[PDB]
Each structure stands twice: as structure tokens, then as C-alpha cells.
Amino acid sequence: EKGVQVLLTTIGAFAAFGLMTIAISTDYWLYTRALICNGGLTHSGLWRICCLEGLKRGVCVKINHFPEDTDYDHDSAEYLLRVVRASSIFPILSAILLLLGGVCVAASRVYKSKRNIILGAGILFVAAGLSNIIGVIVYISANAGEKNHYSYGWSFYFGGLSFILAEVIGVLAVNIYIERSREAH
Amino acid sequence: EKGVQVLLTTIGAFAAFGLMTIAISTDYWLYTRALICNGGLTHSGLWRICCLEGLKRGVCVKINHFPEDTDYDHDSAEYLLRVVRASSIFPILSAILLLLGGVCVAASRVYKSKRNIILGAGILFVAAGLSNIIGVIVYISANAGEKNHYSYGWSFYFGGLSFILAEVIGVLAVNIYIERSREAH
Amino acid sequence: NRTYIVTTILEDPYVMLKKNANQFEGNDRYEGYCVELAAEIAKHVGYSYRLEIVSDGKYGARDPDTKAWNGMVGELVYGRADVAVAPLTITLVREEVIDFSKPFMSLGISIMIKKPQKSKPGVFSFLDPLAYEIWMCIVFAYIGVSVVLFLVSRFSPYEWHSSNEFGIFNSLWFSLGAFMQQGCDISPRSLSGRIVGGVWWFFTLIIISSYTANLAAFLTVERMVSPIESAEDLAKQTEIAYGTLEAGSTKEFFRRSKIAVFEKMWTYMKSAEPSVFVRTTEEGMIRVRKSKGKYAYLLESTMNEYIEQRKPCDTMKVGGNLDSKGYGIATPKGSALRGPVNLAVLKLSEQGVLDKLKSKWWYDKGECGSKDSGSKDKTSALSLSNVAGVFYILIGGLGLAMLVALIEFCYKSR
Amino acid sequence: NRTYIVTTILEDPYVMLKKNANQFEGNDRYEGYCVELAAEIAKHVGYSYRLEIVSDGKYGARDPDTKAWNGMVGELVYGRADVAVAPLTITLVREEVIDFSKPFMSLGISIMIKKPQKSKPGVFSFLDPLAYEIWMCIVFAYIGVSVVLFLVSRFSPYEWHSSNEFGIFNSLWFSLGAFMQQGCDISPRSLSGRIVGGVWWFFTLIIISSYTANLAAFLTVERMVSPIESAEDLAKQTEIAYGTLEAGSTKEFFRRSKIAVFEKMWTYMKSAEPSVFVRTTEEGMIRVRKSKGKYAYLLESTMNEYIEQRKPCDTMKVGGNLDSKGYGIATPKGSALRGPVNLAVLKLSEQGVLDKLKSKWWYDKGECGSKDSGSKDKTSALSLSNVAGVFYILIGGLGLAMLVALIEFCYKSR
Amino acid sequence: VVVTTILESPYVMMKKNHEMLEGNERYEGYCVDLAAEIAKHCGFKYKLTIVGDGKYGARDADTKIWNGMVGELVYGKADIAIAPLTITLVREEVIDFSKPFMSLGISIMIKKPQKSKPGVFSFLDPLAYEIWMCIVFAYIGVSVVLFLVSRFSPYEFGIFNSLWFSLGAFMRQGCDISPRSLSGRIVGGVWWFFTLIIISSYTANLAAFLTVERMVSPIESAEDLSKQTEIAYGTLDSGSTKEFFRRSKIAVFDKMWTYMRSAEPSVFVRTTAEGVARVRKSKGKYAYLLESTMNEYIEQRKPCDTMKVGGNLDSKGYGIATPKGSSLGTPVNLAVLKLSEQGVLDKLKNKWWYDKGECGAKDSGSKEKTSALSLSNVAGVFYILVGGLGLAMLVALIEFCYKSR
Amino acid sequence: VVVTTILESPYVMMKKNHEMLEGNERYEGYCVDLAAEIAKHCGFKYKLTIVGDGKYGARDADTKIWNGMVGELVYGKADIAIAPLTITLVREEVIDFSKPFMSLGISIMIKKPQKSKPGVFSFLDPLAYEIWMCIVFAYIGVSVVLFLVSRFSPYEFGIFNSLWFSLGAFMRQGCDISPRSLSGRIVGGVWWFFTLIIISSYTANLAAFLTVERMVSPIESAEDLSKQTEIAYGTLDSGSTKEFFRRSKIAVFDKMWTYMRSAEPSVFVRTTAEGVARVRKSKGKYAYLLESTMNEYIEQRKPCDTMKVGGNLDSKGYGIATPKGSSLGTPVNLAVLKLSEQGVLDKLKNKWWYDKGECGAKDSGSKEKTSALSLSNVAGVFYILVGGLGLAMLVALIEFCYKSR
């Protein structure tokens, strides 16, 4: 309450925007073994795997997502998963929606008469969550194959907070639109 | 309606009383083979099995319910089932309750001022059903042992109607007690 | 040019008397795999042949006391025959006294079983996990529970003339909703009605879990059925019976067999009762058809395949061949006809001629056809045949509901 | 009276050097099954004995090139010994040159496996049928569904300022009730909220059926585990490895074995890698302990039982005895001591003396005891160990609820 | 030469062709096969012979003469006994035994553990009594905690309605009311989560109870047979087995002998066939103690109703016998071994017990099968139902009479 | 005397003790064992010999000379060839073959059908598309029938609320409303009964889908291999197998030859090892056509990744060879039969293929196992969920803009 509810919204969007962009471009998502090392430890990511021990240490190389196999351009479902996983459009989309939503909120402190601007931002913050939780199901389902052991890093959890924060600021932005409308009716 | 609701109640009790007593003392319940015949066809009952073909035909002999076995007086649950199945107290109880209930109803046409007499009869008609449906679970669970084929007769279904009729006249007797009470209040 | 004798035998389909042979004469009186083989052989070698059946009606055997060869082998050794195109299994005793060509058909012992039926699941098969008595006692207990609830909710004037909505009709509705794990718009408020509701709920929970679990057991067990696929499976198990033809050399192969498997089967064979063995192969066929999958005959591959394409096609060859043998063409010792015969048999074998004739006389004349026989969906997913009865019940209930709606409209209007 | 030599061997527990043998002297320097047997034998026969260990430290063998007997057999043939009370397996080569008494202990080859552990199910094992990712994605999807429902039910002023009860808190309540198949006091009335509710309901149905089915599969599979109970089970399967002592006569029994089973095991034995065999029986014991149930040693029954009653008792004898043999007392050819020795061994055998001594030195000195070893409940009913975590969750939730009730009271009062 | 023998299956049993074939081929069995390889190694001629008198051998307490098969060998009536004769002190003093060609021991015989008749309250079997007991306390605990929360910190949820809410949550039924506070909602959720696991656990394990049959014997040893008292056990009235328990000083077998004599009715029997039938008829309440070989043979014969359970209580063996001062003594002593290392005796053991076995020699012959649930399976919950309805009417009248007053 | 031979496992393979042991014991295999019994029957002396040139035998189209192992026998370099030589016309004209000691045929080789990667919308697998399709029509049918009943014969239950009631009944969730008429209640009950069967059927069959693994090959013959086009198949570039399809006039094998030459990329290979790897790498999209013996041997060798499927397309055999006019011709012709009836050749067949088999020779070596469900198993219903939420917000704005107008 007290009218600082907007400040929490725009603060959350900016942090939730950073915690997603930083998560994408940091490649400390997974911790596993893949035989590229010489398998050996890795701290992989959305784009590039990177060995951690052995002679190859501190050297990071792009992940293929298309090793030579008959399934390439053959399995409709498997290929489509690999297209979206390679592009990572869904996590990338999530950061875009938070950016637009934060702009709309900041563009609602000015043009303070309008209320439907805030409704857009609240929807974008909500739609960011759906893209985010889609962007992790794809990543998890893609990593699986066919008793190896893996672990999840801290860039993974950075994407997790961006879901929680985005869903919170969707609630507050709606509550703002509710409160604003009642004052106007 | 129209006050003949009592006539249906007492008519049902008298028929439901006959259809149960006749069912008990008729021994055309089951149709199976038991090796007493020479196994061969039977039309068994609650008390006496009776062959149907072979040299032994038209000769009916009591069912034992206690062939020589270690379970006699040893298995608490199995022995108790065999005590009640041999006595058939639950079906015999059901006909008694219908008889008392019909007497109470006939004793309510006279002493027409009272209403709590009818409530007793409605409860007895209901309690007859519970004893009846107990009296058939016992009979079915007792017949089983351990791919033979059996079939159920028409004295079985006579006990079935006594359940249906008894539960119907429990509804009508209660509805009478409801209608009588409202006229008095 | 001197015509040469052939000495076939009337075993099916190698030689068959034609549909109406009385008007026909000569070699055209007959047809079969062996007849066309002899035609091809005569074409390649360059002679002319005159077919014949052995008077004895048998293939070949050594008379022990008489020291005499019977059947076709006898007709070859004793100059009554120059060729033998029929199926003569290559053996040591036969090869000693006569010369065999290379085999034109390789075969062996095989297992013959009653074909699994379509196994139509049947309407009202979803009730199978629970007995008829359970369902009917559920119905009667539902009636009793509804009546008791109506009583203990509509007996007391102190809450009646004021109240409870639990009449008989709403009580039946409540019980029906409770049994299906669906809530209703009402719930008991008294202690009696609440006891009734709780115990009925417990009954419902137990019964539904029992249905689901037993159905899962049914489908799992029906999925793990391993059909017979070899002889070792028959050796390990003993539920399904199996036997041979006692007259023939099949029992000669089993009595003498030294491998652990076939020795085990031989020990089972004579010990069993009343008779796994059967006098004639037709009798074994119709016995396996009548046994309802409980008897497995043991037979040459060729007759098994032949029977598999003759009406009634309630039989199936299963597994591979236990042994390996070969039918072959025979000639007397030292005949000038040996070389051309063997070379022509091989030349036909590299060509598709023998395979063509086999496909002609086993499959093209298949009364029941092949259609890639034995293929199946091989899917355990439940099908509409399993759960058709509940759809029929739904349709009947909807029709009854519309009928009762019409009756309600008529009663209310007038 | 002339004292007689005995020539034991220090194999455990037949003869053991005492805990502190330096101060002790004579036959009291030693203890074991064989020592008490020799005491009883001397008592019955009526002589006095002086124990001895073979310098070579072995039982007996024929030197092929030297044509010499080693060990105790050598000490018996060459006059250095009058008796041999130690465990001497009865063989053809030994019995030719020396006289054996009747056996005082019958034995054979047996299977030694790592004892199955208690297998504590573990807290939070009811989550096993579904992966960690599924549970966490369920949580996040529940949050998303609740927020979306709150949005599409509390965004339109045309139904807001008038209305819907679906706030954020009631939306979370509705989603939580939906996931658990429990109804709530509210339900959506709009098209958007109804789409959300329906699809969430579908999700719930699929997920719960998956949990129940996979759990049923877990328990069923864990119930059908057939532990090893014989050698033919090891012959048929190949997942579990097994080997012998290569130095000893066990491999001498397996290389020469002619039965189909043991021939199959022998074929597996040498083919495998890196080495199923092991240099010493202690090494095989500790290897089976370390292998985590994946290696099964093959050993004499007596040492298997002995190891089964020594800490760490992580080992078990399984199945019966593959063969039958007998340890026995030996004497030189033509000795006057043969008859009394044999008769005394038998007289002890009909009495409980040998059984008493075996129970004394195998079980009464059992470091880990017996307590009717190997017994179990043998019940597949689920136990409180399996589902303890959900009770703990319930208790934690109740405590949190009471705490939040206190906080609510404090906030409302002041 | 004279191979004295006795007839007992599979050691010696008359061949079906007893009349047309005479002499050596007249008889057949395990011993019949064995004497061929003994004579093949030695070379001596032999003729199949049966002991005229059915006794094995013993000395009368008064006459002091040897009856039966051994009496043939003592008095020179024969020269060898390839027969199932136990090695014993009294028999060794007068004749010279071979080494044991088949090791032996007393064993236990039981009926095969069949699928028991399903009991009432069998529907509780998927969950142990600990879970059922702890479900109730949680049901009490949750309903109480909902009452305290709703009264101390209200927004009806009394005690009587809270017990209804928790019960309706356990059965997946529709609660008439729902909590409206946070503290009441936290209690409902964990209760709701608790049920979902428990119902699935019941349904899941029951599917295992019906899909897979796993029958475990009541006993696996003799310790388990002496401690308990439900199951009985007996031996032949005249035999070494009764004697072995009589003279035994071990605590467990002394404990048995107290039971055996204090038998009401008598545990003992006159012949092994009586003990077989008593096991085959007592339905798992009788355990016949005999030798390990009849039990192994009987286990592999029809109707295939019994099994040998546990280890062996005693160690003994059968041995070929020759008279005192026989040139045959050392060959047979050297021949049975030569068969034993070679593995011949194992092959004959398999031949006459396991191979030529009517029961399939393994459980693989049997296959899993299902049965539709019968009223006996779930009769306990009909009784619970009908019991509850009688209670409900009973409680209502109490309310009626109370309300009238 | 001179036993010409070639080295190919298990017929002849160099023994590990190639250096220290020389001569007959240098080599080992199926043929090596066989020549012992052939020479045991005949009695003649023999020495193990390898053909210097790896070819089996054929006549050059220009030179017209016999290469390889047969060229040894034509030109008198040896007298017998106990080796895997197919009986054929061109080889029979110049030398005299024995009878077939192992029957043969072209076969099919595939990768073992593995547990496939689970697909999205795999949660529908327990129920066929017919049931799912007919569930929807019933859902439409019930909701419609509830509307007509409630409007024509009222006591709200519109169309929009009736679709909600039926959906909430299918998911065992609490209906906000219930029918109050008899006709509306009859519709609800049968719908309620319908769901209870369907939900249990889904849950029951899924427990079978997870409890039991049942993998069926895509093909079981060659008809199924020619009709389809997803799976490929090839032969060696130079061999009889390519020739057999070339000259074949049967419709099915002529159909194959169209595919084989019209290969993009080439189906053919230069050696059998290439075809093995291509099957072991194509993940079930390649089917190598070869002889029935290598396939049986390979099926029993590590990594145990392939199987022989279907019957045999052609019938042929291997035969012992001798030169034209050899006294050895009739014994070997009479010896292989003597082995064949006695069953020796079967025992060697088991010895070198099945026994000494790395794969356990049966599925009993493998055991059932379970795996916790992963997100890939049930990702289809997360996508359906998140797809529905995006639809719900989309529909709401349409209502918003419409309501604004």
C-alpha cells in the first residue's frame, strides 16, 4: 500500500530482467560429464559447454544440439524440440516481455490518467512466466537420453526467481489496475 | 395417498413374510454338483441338499456344515460363520421382524391415536432388510472353497423380494408417521 | 529313345489325383509339386517319362528278417524303376544302396499348435474384475443405505416439521454420488446420517481400489503371457501336452536323441497319459484343433506349412526347425542318369523354380490365404471392444432420460 | 604304553593356536574341533597322544615327477605319523595308500553370497515414482495457474466493481483443492476461468494416475524378485558373477564335471573377465563383501558356515550342497589302530558328540550369533518406514498452522 | 555273485515286465543301475537277489542272531549287499561297510503352502496395522487442530464438523465446508496431500497382492517347528528316528521328544504312508519327520503336494556291505569313490529323483493366473457397513428418547 | 591327407596358442572339430591346412582357371576341403560335393528393438484413439442431453453450465451444481458410472505399461520389409546375395532390387563389418541381409545388440568337396549323414554358437526393472496446460474488448 506498490513492480521487473539475461548468458546451468573432457566435469549452459578439469580447462566450446543422426530432420517432435532448445527463444522471449512490461509501467507513472497500460504490463509479466516454465521443460526434456549423475547450478535458479518475481509483479500490477479503476468508478 | 397407504404396508409385510418363510423352507436355492449324487446335479438349500438325477433321485438329506476337519472349533472366524450359516438365524430373524412389524401396523389401525407404534414397525421392516442382506452374504461366503459351475434358484430370489418389499414398506410407514405427526402439529 | 519310369507316391501335395481323373490318361492324370519337378527335369535332361505309383504305397524300409527293401527303394534296387521324384528323406541306409541327388527341399521337425483365436473381449467385460455377487450386493446395500439415511434424517419431528432435505429421492442421489466419488449439493448434519455417510464412503473407497487393482492385475498378467517359440520352452514347461507319430521316424529320432532337451521331451512323451501319441497325422491335426491349445503336435515342416494353408486354418507352425534334413531325387546305383539329374536339380535351385513351385502349391492354392499371416497390431492399449458395454449403458441411460423427460412434461402439463 | 603322533593342521577352526600360547605347553597349546575329537578318540581307544603340525603346512598331494606324497599323507606313509585327525577329504588317491575311517563330517560345494542388507526404505521414498523435476514443475505450474486464474477473474471492471470471489488467495486454494481431487466452496463462472480449471483438472488426473501406476509397478517388481536358491539359477542367469579358488580341487571338480549345469558354469568361469577367480579364500570373502551382491563365491560348506558366524556377518550360505564329500580320520596301511578309530568315530556320531562340537565351534562362538538367522517377516504389506515422510509433513504443517494462528491472533488483537 | 537287496523305490522296484523278463532285468532302480558299474570296475559276475525277509538287520535282545539282509551276509548266504543300509556301530562290528555312496539326514516334510482361504478384514492387508493405527491418530490430530485454530483465531468448524471435514477428505468426497483462514487452509492441504499418498499406496500395493502370488512357508528349520505349537509332527512308531530323538541330549531335539510322547492324539504312525496322508490331509498342521531321500522322491511324485523344508538334523549315510574277510571289500571301497569323483552317482541321483520327475522339477512349470474378486474377499466391509447402519438407527432412537425428555 | 580350409569364425579361427602349439592344434573351430570325426570314421590321416589365397572359388571370365580353395582341389594340390563351401552348379561340374552338413539361407539382421525415447502425448498410450475420440462425443452428447432435459422439462443448467458439469464429473472434481430432476439425475449417474470405469482403465493399463516391457520388432519377414520405406537394407557390393536379388523373378525380391540400386545414399557395403556397424548405428533404420549363420553367430557375440529376424529367403547348404575321381568321395558322403542322424553336427552347432555364448542364449538372463517417470514422459500435459493458460488470457481480452464496445 501507500502508493509505493508501483515502485516494487518496476523494481521487480528490472531485477527479474537481469536475473534472466544473466542466467542465459552465464552458462553455469548444469554440472555433469559428457566425454568432451579428458567423461570429465563440466559447467554447461544453454549455448556452450565448457570443461572444468583435465588438460582442457577454462576452454568453452559451443554445444552442437545436432550430432549426426538419422533423427535430424526426420522425427517431427524431436527435431522441433531441438530447434527451440537451440534457439532458446522461450527464455529469450521471457526477458523481452519483462522489458516491455517494465517500460509500460514506467510509461504509466507518466500518462498517469490511463489504466489499461498497466493491464498490458501485468499480462506481459504473467506471459513471461509461461514462457519461462516452458523454457525449462524444454531444457530438461532435451538433456535426457535413452546410471549417470547430474546436478543443477545457480544460473538455473536465477531463471527460477525470474518466474517467481514475474508472477508476483503480475499480481501487484493487476491490484494497481483494480485500485485505479475503483477510484475512477 | 388416499389413506390406503396403510393397506399397502400391511399387504407388503404379509407377502414379504411369506416370501421369506417359503424361501427358507423350500430348498431350491442352489444348483450345483457335490459328489453326493452318483458329481451329479442337486437343488440344494439352507438346510438339506437333495440329488436330482442318478439312482438317488427325489431323496433329500441334511447338509452337514461340519465335515471332519481341523478347522472345527479352531478357526474363530470360519467356525463363527459356520455356526450362523447352520442356524440361519439372520434369515429367520428377518421373517420375525416382518411379522412383528405387520402386527404393529395392524395394531395401529386400532389404537389409531398413537403414532410411535408405526415408527417401530418402520424400523423393524428396515432392520429386516439388514438381517436379510447379512443372511445372503453369509450363505454365499460359506459356499465358497479354496473350475466348477453353480447357479442360483428361485427361492434365492424370493428372499430378494422380501428385502425390496421390506425396504419399501419401511419408507411408507415412515411417511405415514410423518403425515400423522403433521396433522397433530 | 526309351521311356523311363518315375515311381511317384500319392502323398499330398507332391502328387495328387486330379479333380476328375477318369477321363484323363497318362501323366496328365496327375498333378503336384513333384510332377512339375519331373517335367522340368525331363526338359533339362532330355528324356520322356511315364509316371507310376508304388503298389505297396510306401517310401522305403528294410525288411529285417526278409532282408528286403520295400516301396520306392525296392522298385529302384530291383530294376522296376529308373527314377524316384517323390519326397525321399536322405538317410544312411538308403544312400548305401541307391544314389541321391542334391536336395530340392530342406526341412526338419517343427511344432504345430492350435492357432490363437481372435479372443473377442466381449461386451460387459469391464465387470470381470468383480464377481456378479459383489455387484448385486453393492446394489442392494446402496438401497439399504439410502433407506436408512432417509429414516434417520426424516423420523424426528423436532427437525422435521420445522429441516433436513434428505428425502428418499435425495438420499438415493447422495448414495449414488458417494459411490462414484462425486460430491452432491447436500451432506448430512446429524450424527446418524454422518455415521451412515462415512461408512458408505469407506465401502466405496475399498471397492473402487479393489476394482482398479484387480483390473491392473488382469491386464498385467495378460501382457506377460509368453507364447511358445521353441522346443526348450516345451521342455521346461509341462502344462501343454505334445506328442508325435509313433509309426514314423520322428519317434526314431526322439528315442535315440542325446541332447538334454530332446531327451527330456522323450522322457515326458512315453510317461504321460492317456496317449500324447496319435495313430495318424490327420488325427493329430484334428486333436490339436479340438484340444483348445493344450496339445502341440510335432511334424515335418512341409506338412505343417501345408496344413497352415488349408481350411480350417486353426493351426500354426511355431518356432524353427529342430533338425535339418532334405528330400531328394533317387536313382539306382551306377545309372547314367545321376549326373544330369543332380545338375538339373541344382540349376533349378539357383533359379527360382523350386521356390516358385513351393509358393504355388503351398500358398497360391491356400484356401485361407496368407495376407502376411500371423501379423498383428502387437499393441496392449485398451480398445473400444473392451469398454463397449459402458458406452451402451450410457446411451441407454440417455434414452431413458429423454423418455422420462417426455413423461414428466406430460404429467406436469396435464 | 607308547605315545602316538597325531599331525594336525592349523586350519581354522579345526585347530587354533590359543589366545596366549607362549606360556602353555603340550597338547594344551591348541584348541579346536579336531582337538576335542582327538581327546574323545583317545578316551575311547585308550591311548595317549602328542599333537603336531606338519612342517610343510598342507594336507596332501602326489608329486608327479618326484612320485612323493606331501603333507600329512606323506607323514603317514613314511612313518612320521600314526594318526591324522585334521580334515582330510576322502579321495581315491589317498585311500589307495592309507586307510580312512568313516566320515565325521559330511559336506560339499556351496554358494556364498553377500547378505542382503536391511534395505531401509528411507524417508521421502513415496516421492520416488516421480522425478524431482516433475514435482518442482508441478509446484511452479500451480503458481502459474493460480495467478492466471486470479488475473482472468479479477481484471474486468464490468464483473469486478459490481462479482468474482477468485482473488489470489482463493485462487491458490482452488488450485490446491483441484490437484488433490477435493472440491472447493467456489468454482469459476467465466469462460477463461473454466478453461483454466478444466485443463488443470486434466493435468491433475494424468499426474495422479501416473503416480499410482508407477508405484504399483515399483511394488510389484520388488515383489517378484527371486533370490538365488540353487546353482541352476546361476547357470541360467549371467548378471551376477561367480568364481572359485583356482589352486584347490574345486576347479578340479569343475573342469572335469560332465553334468550340463556345471559344464555351463565352467564355460562361463574361464571366459569371463577380469578374474572371477581369486587367489585366496579370504580375498574371495572380502571381494563378495565389497562387490555389493554382484559376486558369488563357491566354497566348502564348512568354511561358508564358519564365515557366516564371524564378524562382519555380511555373508550367507545359499542353496544346498552341489556335491557330497566327507572329512575323515586317516591311519597308515595295516595299522592296529584302524578298527577302534572307526568304531569310536561311529559311536560318537550316533551320539550327539560331533553335532555338539560343531554347534560349539561354529555357533556358540558365533561373534554375530544366530537368533534363527535369516528369518524375516516375509510380508509385502507396506510399513510405516515407507510412508514416514508424509506423516512428518503432516506434523510440520500442523505446527506451522498453530504458529500462524498465534500470529493471526496477535495481528488481529493488536 | 549274490547281490542281496531289498525292494524300495527308487532303489529297487519291480519292473512292469516282471514275468516275461527274468533275472537281472526283472528288477530296476537306483541300486540296480549302480551294481552294473561296481561290477564293471571289479569285473565279477552278479545276479539280482532279493532278501527273503523284509527286515534290514538287527540283533534280537534274547536270541542274538542277525535277521534280514545282513543276516544273509554274516552266515555266508551271500557276499555283497548293494542296498540302502545305514552305516552304524552295531552293523560295523560284524561286517565291513564301504564308504558312503549317498549322504543322508533326517528332514522335515510339509504340505505345499497353498493359497489360503481369504479372511474377513483381508482388505486391510495392503497396509500394516501400524499405518491404520497411525491414520486414526492423525485424523484425531487434524480435526482437533482445526477446531483450536478456528475457535481461538476465527474469521463454523466446531469439533463435530471438523471430524466430518477430515473424514470427507480421507475418502476423496466433497467437503460441505472449506476453511476460510490461512491457518485452517494449511491444515487442510497437508491432510489432503496425506490422503493422496495413502489411497494410492493402498491401491498400488493391492495390485501387487493380486498380480503376484508369494507364498512363504510357516517354517524353514526345526527351531521354528519346536517353538510353535499350532503345527504337529510325528515319526514312525518303530524306527531309528524315534530312537534318535529319545537318546538326543541337544536342547531342541529333547524339546521335541516331550511333545512327541505327550501326543493327544498320537503324532506317531505305523508306516510312512500314514504320515504322508496325515500331512496331505491336515492342511499344513502336520510336519512329518523322515529321511531326506523319501522326502526328495515324494516331492517329485504325483500329486506333487509336499516339499522338503529346512536342512538336515542328523548326518548319516548308506554304505555297501561285505562280510568280514571278503576279497570284494577293497574294490567296492575303491569303486564307490571312483564313481563319486567322476560324478556318476550324481547322474543316477538326478535320473531317479529329478529327471523322470512328474512335478516339472521347478516352479517354471506353473504359471501366474488371476481370479475375479469374490464376496469372501470383501465381506468384511459389507459387515462393517451393515454394522454401521444398525448403529446409526440405534443412535437416532437415543437422540429421539433424549429429545422427547 | 591335405585338408584345405579357410579361416572364418567359428569354422576356423587361429588359436591363442598359435606359436607354441603347431600343426593340427594350431587351428580351431567348427570345421576343426568336424574333420576329427570324418577321419575317425574313414581312418585316413589328415593335417590342418589353410588356403593361401582367400577366395573360395570361381572361374575367371577370360582366363578360365579356378582360384582359391577349389583351385587347390582341381589341380591336385589337395584331396579334401572341409570348409564352408556352398553347393552350386558351377562348382559341381568340376568337383564332387558331399551332402549338406549344414542347411542355410539368406536372412535378415536388425538392431535389437530398444526402449524408445518416450514421446510427447505418450500419456494417451494406455487408451486407443478410438476411446479418446468417443469420449469427446459422449461428453458432447451428455451435455446436450442435459440441456434439452433441463429446458424442455425444467424444475440453471444451460449449455455452458452443462458442459462444465460433465467435465467436472470426468475429472472426479466437485460439481458446483447437481441435477434436481429425475431425468437430469439419470444422465448424471450413467456419466458418473462411465468415468469410474474409464479412469480406472487408464490407471490400470498404465500400470501394465510401466510394470512390463514388451518390445515388438517392426518386422517379422521380408514382405513387411519391402512394403515399408522407413527402414533401409543392403548387401555386400560383391557377393552372391546381390546376384540372388538380381536374377530373382519373384515379385517381392524383384521389388527389393529396385530399392537396392536406387539407393541414396548407397545401401551396399564393401564388407560385412560395415553392414554390422550400419545396423548398430542406424538405430533400427537399417536391415542387413546376409547368411543365416553369421547372423546366428553375431547374435550370440558381444555387445549382443542384434538379432536374426524372420525365416530364410533362399535354401542352400555347405558341402564337403573332393576332386573328380577320389576314393574319399563315398566315405565323406556316408560320414556326414552318419554324423547327421546321430546328432553330432547339432552338438557342434550348439557348441560354437549357443554354448560358449556371451549373451546368455535367452531373455532369462535379463530381468525386469523400473524407472521413475521423467519430465519427458509427461511433458505433453505441461504443454497442454501452458497452452490452455495462454488461450484463457487470450479469450479474456476478447471478452474485454467486446465488453468495452
Ligand SMILES: Oc1nc2ccc(-c3c(Cl)cccc3OC(F)(F)F)cc2[nH]1
Ligand atoms: O529458467 C528457469 N526457469 C525455472 C523454473 C524453475 C526452476 C527450478 C527451481 Cl527455482 C528449483 C528447483 C527446480 C527447478 O526446475 C524445475 F523446472 F522446477 F524443475 C528453474 C528454472 N530456470
Ligand SMILES: CCCCCCCCCCCCCCCC(=O)O
Ligand atoms: C451418445 C452420443 C454418442 C456417443 C456414444 C458413442 C458410442 C460408441 C460405441 C461404439 C462401440 C464399438 C463397438 C464395436 C467395436 C469396434 O469398434 O471394433
